Paper text:
5A and 2C9 neutralised all three bYFVs. Next, we carried out symmetry expansion in cisTEM2 to obtain a 4 Å reconstruction of the bYFV17D asymmetric unit (ASU) complexed with Fab 2C9. This 4 Å cryo-EM map of bYFV17D:2C9 was used to build an atomic model of the ASU. We also determined a crystal structure of the free 2C9 Fab, which closely matched the cryo-EM structure.
Yellow fever virus (YFV) is a re-emerging flavivirus that causes severe hepatic disease and mortality in humans. Crystallographic studies have resolved the structure of the YFV E protein and shown that its domain architecture is similar to related flaviviruses, with three N-terminal ectodomains, known as domains I (DI), II (DII) and III (DIII) and a stem anchor region known as the transmembrane domain (TM). Here we use a chimeric virus platform to resolve the first high resolution cryo-EM structures of YFV. Stark differences in particle morphology and homogeneity are observed between vaccine and virulent strains of YFV, and these are found to have significant implications on antibody recognition and neutralisation.
Author numbering:
A (entry chain B): 1 to 212
B (entry chain A): 1 to 135, 138 to 222
Write the structure that this text describes.
């Protein structure tokens, strides 16, 4: 019933920066509002409750302000452990409602991808399918274009991609692109190339192999 | 140390029923209000149920008639009995403790690790694990991995060399294939000089199907 809207949806920041995130409610909440942090693949963890109060053990850099409908969370000096998604929660009236979240990622310098290509295994081909995998390792920013080229014929509709969350040590991303073809179509062609374009590279990088 | 530990998830056919459990520790369970919250595949959080210090339950309309929250203050256990399950209930389910004042009208202080629920008509299918073989230039790095293909439901866990190898490992998120089955890749970057002498094995586990696989990745 009560709507919780957050701003920005996502944002990059540098360590030591002062970050402020917003939460807006559709009704007067009387400061019954908590801020939680959830890191990728982990459980939520409460930072602020009652809008202004630090929870047990929460660093002093975290502060909460607001009243009525408009509330805010502020990190005085950003730290590596502060990355993740931040949610707001109203517990003033049932049903308790959560904001959509604000993803907070770490700014860093451009980083070039290491590109690798993997031909399909003999085990798989016996099953009738052929998966060709292109790997981009440790790059920044997230944006990257991966084009498949079978015998210099650009591919479309037959590939999927997956991207990791920001690395803990280098804050880079890694990407996996899989081209799946039937074994019949796979045996019909020779050159399997993966062309990568990314801001850390001066010119696109193409990794390829010949089925023979 | 507050510890909330959930158990009891898994795969359920539509219209079925299942019970979730949350083992509380590190606090006088009886005085604290408790709640169930779930996280959808889109990663949105939805309040599912709450129970006061006086065993009074509270629900949203979406689950009102089907889910029942209960608690056994003797063993320090929170329950979520779900019935008439719908495909829209697929989500990660968390238990959460409330403030020390005992009211359900408080923040969610501590959260459990979460237990996963998938509501599907389909049967569990274990993955096919294929090697992503590395080819090398002296002084360069080589990439190897495992392709974990065609499994349902999530999740699949992957370790390398039974956990001995963690450095440089990237296990990507699962993608839904046009077939309706899931597929993930797990890769590890290693020094080229070590490829002919070091053995690399990915240990793939798919608990929904009780499927363990150990594929040894060799150069080509
Ligand atoms: Cl279904």
């Amino acid at each position: 019933e009560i709507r919780m809207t957050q701003s920005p949806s996502s944002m990059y920041a540098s360590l030591g920066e002062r970050v402020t995130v917003t939460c807006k409610a559709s009704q007067d909440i009387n400061s019954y509002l908590s801020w939680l942090q959830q890191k990728p693949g982990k459980s939520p963890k409460t930072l602020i409750y009652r809008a202004n109060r630090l929870f047990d053990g929460v660093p002093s850099r975290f502060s909460g302000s607001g009243s009525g409908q408009d509330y805010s969370l502020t990190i005085s000096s950003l730290e590596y452990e502060d990355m993740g998604i931040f949610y707001c929660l109203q517990y003033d009236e049932f049903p308790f409602t959560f904001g959509s979240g604000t993803k907070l990622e770490l700014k860093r310098t451009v980083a070039a991808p290491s590109v690798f290509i993997f031909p399909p295994s003999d085990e798989q081909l016996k099953s009738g399918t052929a998966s060709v995998v292109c790997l981009l390792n440790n790059f920044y920013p997230r944006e990257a274009k991966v084009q498949w080229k079978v015998d210099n014929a650009l591919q479309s509709g037959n590939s999927q991609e997956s991207v990791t969350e920001q690395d803990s040590k280098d804050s880079t991303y890694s990407l996996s692109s899989t081209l799946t073809l039937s074994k019949a179509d796979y045996e019909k062609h020779k050159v399997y190339a993966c062309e990568v374009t990314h801001q850390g590279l001066s010119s696109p990088v193409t990794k390829s192999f010949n089925r023979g | 140390e507050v510890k909330l530990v959930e158990s009891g998830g898994g795969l359920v056919k539509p219209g079925g029923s299942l019970k979730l459990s949350c083992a509380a520790s590190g606090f006088t369970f009886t005085n604290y209000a408790m709640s169930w919250v779930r996280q959808t595949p889109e990663k949105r959080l939805e309040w599912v149920a709450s129970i006061s210090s006086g065993h009074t339950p509270y629900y949203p309309d979406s689950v009102k008639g089907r889910f029942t929250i209960s608690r056994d203050n003797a063993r320090n256990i929170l329950f979520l009995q779900m019935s008439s399950l719908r495909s829209e209930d697929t989500a990660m389910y968390y238990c959460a403790r409330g403030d020390y004042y005992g009211s359900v009208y408080s923040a969610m202080d501590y959260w459990g690790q979460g237990t996963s629920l998938t509501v599907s008509s389909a049967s569990t299918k274990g993955p096919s694990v294929f090697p992503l073989a590395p080819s090398s230039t002296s002084g360069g790095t080589a990439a190897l991995g495992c392709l974990v293909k065609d499994y349902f439901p999530e999740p699949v866990t992957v370790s390398w060399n039974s956990g001995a190898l963690t450095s440089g490992v990237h296990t990507f998120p699962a993608v839904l294939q046009s077939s309706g089955l899931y597929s993930l890749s797990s890769v590890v970057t290693v020094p080229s000089s070590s490829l002919g002498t070091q053995t690399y094995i990915c240990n793939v586990n798919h608990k929904p199907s009780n499927t363990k696989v150990d594929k040894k990745v060799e150069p080509k």
